[PDB]
Design an enzyme around this catalytic site. Sequence first.
Site, mmCIF file in Angstrom:
data_model
loop_
_atom_site.group_PDB
_atom_site.id
_atom_site.type_symbol
_atom_site.label_atom_id
_atom_site.label_comp_id
_atom_site.label_asym_id
_atom_site.label_seq_id
_atom_site.Cartn_x
_atom_site.Cartn_y
_atom_site.Cartn_z
ATOM 1 N N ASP A 1 19.653 0.546 -15.688
ATOM 2 C CA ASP A 1 20.086 -0.584 -14.798
ATOM 3 C C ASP A 1 20.059 -1.941 -15.538
ATOM 4 O OD1 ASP A 1 20.815 -1.243 -11.893
ATOM 5 O OD2 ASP A 1 19.084 -2.556 -12.036
ATOM 6 N N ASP B 1 5.874 -8.595 -1.467
ATOM 7 C CA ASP B 1 7.110 -8.832 -0.741
ATOM 8 C C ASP B 1 7.354 -7.844 0.385
ATOM 9 O OD1 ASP B 1 7.939 -6.455 -2.065
ATOM 10 O OD2 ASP B 1 9.556 -7.391 -3.171
ATOM 11 N N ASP C 1 5.576 0.762 -3.866
ATOM 12 C CA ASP C 1 5.853 1.626 -5.027
ATOM 13 C C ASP C 1 5.333 3.063 -4.787
ATOM 14 O OD1 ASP C 1 6.796 -0.636 -6.393
ATOM 15 O OD2 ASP C 1 5.174 -0.704 -7.723
ATOM 16 N N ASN D 1 3.500 -3.851 -2.409
ATOM 17 C CA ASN D 1 3.862 -5.065 -3.143
ATOM 18 C C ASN D 1 3.780 -6.244 -2.203
ATOM 19 O OD1 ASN D 1 6.274 -2.814 -4.475
ATOM 20 N ND2 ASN D 1 4.422 -3.517 -5.487
ATOM 21 N N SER E 1 7.574 -4.506 -0.026
ATOM 22 C CA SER E 1 8.054 -3.187 -0.532
ATOM 23 C C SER E 1 6.800 -2.434 -0.978
ATOM 24 C CB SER E 1 8.981 -3.369 -1.700
ATOM 25 O OG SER E 1 8.335 -4.044 -2.715
ATOM 26 N N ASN F 1 10.000 1.588 -6.693
ATOM 27 C CA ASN F 1 9.902 0.574 -5.629
ATOM 28 C C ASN F 1 11.004 0.647 -4.562
ATOM 29 O OD1 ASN F 1 10.539 -2.296 -4.639
ATOM 30 N ND2 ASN F 1 8.461 -2.314 -5.206
ATOM 31 N N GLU G 1 0.886 3.660 -14.358
ATOM 32 C CA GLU G 1 1.506 3.374 -13.042
ATOM 33 C C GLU G 1 0.768 4.055 -11.956
ATOM 34 O OE1 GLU G 1 3.581 1.180 -12.055
ATOM 35 O OE2 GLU G 1 4.638 0.458 -13.885
#
EC number: 3.2.1.17
Length: 129
Positions: free
Chosen positions: A101, A48, A52, A46, A50, A59, A35
Amino acid sequence: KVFGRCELAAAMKRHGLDNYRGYSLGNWVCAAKFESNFNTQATNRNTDGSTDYGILQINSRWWCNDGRTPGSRNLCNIPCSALLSSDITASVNCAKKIVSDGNGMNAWVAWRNRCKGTDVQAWIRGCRL
Ligand SMILES: [Cl-]
Ligand SMILES: [Cl-]
Ligand SMILES: [Cl-]
Ligand code: NA
Protein backbone atom coordinates in the site's frame (compact mmCIF):
# COMPACT_ATOMS: atom_id res chain seq x y z
CA LYS A 1 -3.32 -19.73 19.26
CA VAL A 2 0.10 -18.62 20.48
CA PHE A 3 2.64 -19.72 17.89
CA GLY A 4 6.08 -20.76 18.53
CA ARG A 5 8.63 -18.81 16.60
CA CYS A 6 9.48 -21.43 14.04
CA GLU A 7 5.96 -22.65 13.82
CA LEU A 8 4.93 -19.12 12.85
CA ALA A 9 7.80 -18.82 10.41
CA ALA A 10 6.65 -22.08 8.75
CA ALA A 11 3.11 -20.86 8.60
CA MET A 12 4.02 -17.39 7.16
CA LYS A 13 6.33 -19.13 4.62
CA ARG A 14 3.68 -21.49 3.41
CA HIS A 15 1.20 -18.61 3.09
CA GLY A 16 3.68 -16.67 0.97
CA LEU A 17 5.31 -13.98 3.13
CA ASP A 18 8.93 -14.91 2.67
CA ASN A 19 10.41 -12.15 0.58
CA TYR A 20 6.92 -10.75 -0.09
CA ARG A 21 7.48 -7.19 -1.39
CA GLY A 22 11.13 -7.81 -0.64
CA TYR A 23 10.72 -8.42 3.17
CA SER A 24 12.51 -11.64 4.19
CA LEU A 25 10.55 -13.94 6.39
CA GLY A 26 12.43 -12.85 9.57
CA ASN A 27 10.90 -9.39 9.15
CA TRP A 28 7.38 -10.89 9.35
CA VAL A 29 8.17 -13.14 12.28
CA CYS A 30 9.89 -10.30 14.12
CA ALA A 31 6.87 -8.02 13.46
CA ALA A 32 4.50 -10.65 14.79
CA LYS A 33 6.56 -11.14 17.91
CA PHE A 34 6.48 -7.51 18.93
CA GLU A 35 2.95 -6.81 17.58
CA SER A 36 1.16 -9.73 19.18
CA ASN A 37 3.68 -11.89 21.11
CA PHE A 38 2.81 -14.46 18.42
CA ASN A 39 -0.77 -14.59 19.66
CA THR A 40 -3.49 -14.81 16.94
CA GLN A 41 -6.02 -13.66 19.55
CA ALA A 42 -4.39 -10.35 20.38
CA THR A 43 -6.49 -7.22 20.26
CA ASN A 44 -5.41 -3.68 21.18
CA ARG A 45 -7.65 -0.58 21.02
CA ASN A 46 -6.21 2.56 19.34
CA THR A 47 -6.84 6.12 20.55
CA ASP A 48 -8.97 6.96 17.47
CA GLY A 49 -11.46 4.18 18.34
CA SER A 50 -10.06 1.58 15.86
CA THR A 51 -8.62 -1.69 17.12
CA ASP A 52 -5.70 -3.83 15.99
CA TYR A 53 -6.31 -7.55 15.46
CA GLY A 54 -4.35 -10.77 15.43
CA ILE A 55 -0.87 -11.98 14.91
CA LEU A 56 0.05 -8.86 12.91
CA GLN A 57 -2.18 -6.35 14.70
CA ILE A 58 -4.04 -5.35 11.58
CA ASN A 59 -6.11 -2.17 12.13
CA SER A 60 -9.87 -1.78 11.64
CA ARG A 61 -9.34 1.87 10.54
CA TRP A 62 -8.45 0.62 7.04
CA TRP A 63 -8.20 -3.06 6.71
CA CYS A 64 -10.98 -5.04 8.35
CA ASN A 65 -14.55 -4.49 9.59
CA ASP A 66 -15.14 -4.79 13.37
CA GLY A 67 -18.54 -3.00 13.47
CA ARG A 68 -17.35 -0.24 15.81
CA THR A 69 -14.89 1.95 13.86
CA PRO A 70 -17.10 4.53 12.19
CA GLY A 71 -16.02 5.88 8.86
CA SER A 72 -13.34 3.26 8.48
CA ARG A 73 -12.54 1.11 5.50
CA ASN A 74 -12.32 -2.67 5.07
CA LEU A 75 -9.71 -3.02 2.39
CA CYS A 76 -9.08 -6.66 3.18
CA ASN A 77 -12.83 -7.42 2.84
CA ILE A 78 -12.84 -9.33 6.07
CA PRO A 79 -14.35 -9.17 9.50
CA CYS A 80 -11.60 -8.32 12.00
CA SER A 81 -12.51 -11.49 13.86
CA ALA A 82 -11.11 -13.41 10.82
CA LEU A 83 -7.75 -12.07 11.92
CA LEU A 84 -7.91 -13.77 15.35
CA SER A 85 -8.17 -17.26 13.99
CA SER A 86 -5.49 -19.81 14.81
CA ASP A 87 -5.20 -20.30 11.04
CA ILE A 88 -3.29 -17.17 9.89
CA THR A 89 -4.37 -17.27 6.23
CA ALA A 90 -6.61 -14.15 6.62
CA SER A 91 -3.96 -12.28 8.51
CA VAL A 92 -1.25 -13.08 5.99
CA ASN A 93 -3.42 -12.21 3.04
CA CYS A 94 -4.29 -8.91 4.64
CA ALA A 95 -0.70 -8.25 5.52
CA LYS A 96 0.16 -8.66 1.83
CA LYS A 97 -2.30 -5.93 0.95
CA ILE A 98 -0.98 -3.65 3.70
CA VAL A 99 2.64 -4.02 2.72
CA SER A 100 1.73 -3.33 -0.94
CA ASP A 101 0.00 0.00 0.00
CA GLY A 102 3.07 2.31 -0.40
CA ASN A 103 4.51 2.24 3.10
CA GLY A 104 5.96 -1.20 3.21
CA MET A 105 6.25 -2.68 6.61
CA ASN A 106 6.45 0.73 8.18
CA ALA A 107 2.63 0.15 8.46
CA TRP A 108 3.54 -1.89 11.56
CA VAL A 109 4.89 0.35 14.28
CA ALA A 110 6.50 -2.64 16.10
CA TRP A 111 8.30 -3.54 12.87
CA ARG A 112 9.63 0.01 12.35
CA ASN A 113 10.78 0.26 15.92
CA ARG A 114 12.02 -3.18 16.76
CA CYS A 115 12.85 -4.99 13.50
CA LYS A 116 13.66 -2.56 10.77
CA GLY A 117 17.45 -2.26 10.45
CA THR A 118 18.09 -5.18 12.83
CA ASP A 119 19.31 -8.71 12.11
CA VAL A 120 15.88 -10.10 11.44
CA GLN A 121 17.27 -13.38 10.05
CA ALA A 122 17.71 -14.28 13.77
CA TRP A 123 13.98 -14.77 13.92
CA ILE A 124 14.11 -17.77 11.57
CA ARG A 125 17.36 -19.22 12.89
CA GLY A 126 17.00 -22.93 13.64
CA CYS A 127 13.82 -23.31 11.75
CA ARG A 128 13.19 -26.06 9.22
CA LEU A 129 12.02 -24.00 6.36
CL1 LIG B 1 15.05 -13.48 7.29
CL1 LIG C 1 -1.79 -21.09 9.64
CL1 LIG D 1 9.09 -1.50 0.72
NA1 NA E 1 -12.98 -0.98 9.30
